[PDB]
Amino acid sequence: LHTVIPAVVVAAILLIAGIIAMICYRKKRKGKLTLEDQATFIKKGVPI
Amino acid sequence: PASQHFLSTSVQGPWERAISPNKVPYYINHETQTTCWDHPKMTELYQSLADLNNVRFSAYRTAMKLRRLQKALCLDLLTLSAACDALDQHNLKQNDQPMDILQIINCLTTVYDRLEQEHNNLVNVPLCVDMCLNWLLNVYDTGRTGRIRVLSFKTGIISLCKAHLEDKYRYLFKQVASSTGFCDQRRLGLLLHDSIQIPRQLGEVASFGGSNIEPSVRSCFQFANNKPEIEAALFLDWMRLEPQSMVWLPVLHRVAAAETAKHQAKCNICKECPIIGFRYRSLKHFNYDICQSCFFSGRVAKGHKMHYPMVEYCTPTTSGEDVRDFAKVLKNKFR
């Protein structure tokens, strides 16, 4: 029993790894590629 | 020239096409004492522009048309450094120095030789020189005197070159400020006048307060806490305040940046997925994302509201930021 069932408790660590991976799908590489304008901030939220 | 009688009928009414000693044709608006040129290549460019009167808003129209011009003129290939070196090579440092046709031709040749050496398959020196002379004398040679100011030419090239927005702002401020870096009402007024000479050439000058630069100077010096002179940092802050008469240049920078934007989203009217270009997300409803193709036509889905707030993504989104703003819009709709 101890050699069979505690072989599944590692699936909980598998979940923890999956969750912490998925809370970071854009925090893994924020810069990504085509890093133009890398010393300022460009964003808009009001139509003119 | 023989083309005078042939192409004088392309425009009618008060417009009167006339030829120049530099064999470049130009129209005449005689009672306004203002004159504009029209080369056949720029004639077909403007004919293509005339079918693009579908832009509902003002700043978007100016930015899109100016981006189309800059890409067509291939002046977006010019950087700040090359233009600065070219202007400093010809000793055109005094802003009030009179400029003849020959000096402008020499400076344009200096710029476009380097541009062609970088863009052999994209830049033709004589045609580009003719086109850029056409545009510059359209903006700043309404009197057909053959004399312009160095400051106006500098402002036009620096605005129409490829550089950071704050870098262009700082260079233009240094051009208009004194050796101490201070700018009074008069230099700011001259710079604003040079800036406002541009929209009147296309016909969108009144939408930004007209040609009256006095309210712009008044607002700038009211933001300056009624200081006699303004500084570069205060000028940058007042520009980031997005004044009525200067927002067109940051809107141009944004549309240039967003021309290569690709958003993983669906248009909530024309069902276009993925969104390419400008993505617009409503700040009131849920799951409402519109592409600029339907936004510019004025067609609205589910009708507008008492207030219909909108955010304009010009870059691919960050999941943290959009989850945060989704939480904000759920909070807004909860109340």
From Swiss-Prot, chain A:
It comes from Oryctolagus cuniculus (Rabbit). It is a single-pass type I membrane protein. It is found in: Cell membrane; Cytoplasm, Cytoskeleton; Nucleus, Nucleoplasm; Cell membrane, Sarcolemma. N-glycosylated. A motif (Nuclear localization signal) lies at residues 26-32. It comes from the Eukaryota. Transmembrane protein that plays important roles in connecting the extracellular matrix to the cytoskeleton. Acts as a cell adhesion receptor in both muscle and non-muscle tissues. Receptor for both DMD and UTRN and, through these interactions, scaffolds axin to the cytoskeleton. Also functions in cell adhesion-mediated signaling and implicated in cell polarity. This is Beta-dystroglycan. The modification Phosphothreonine is found at residue 40. Coiled coil: none annotated. The chain crosses the membrane at residues 1-25.
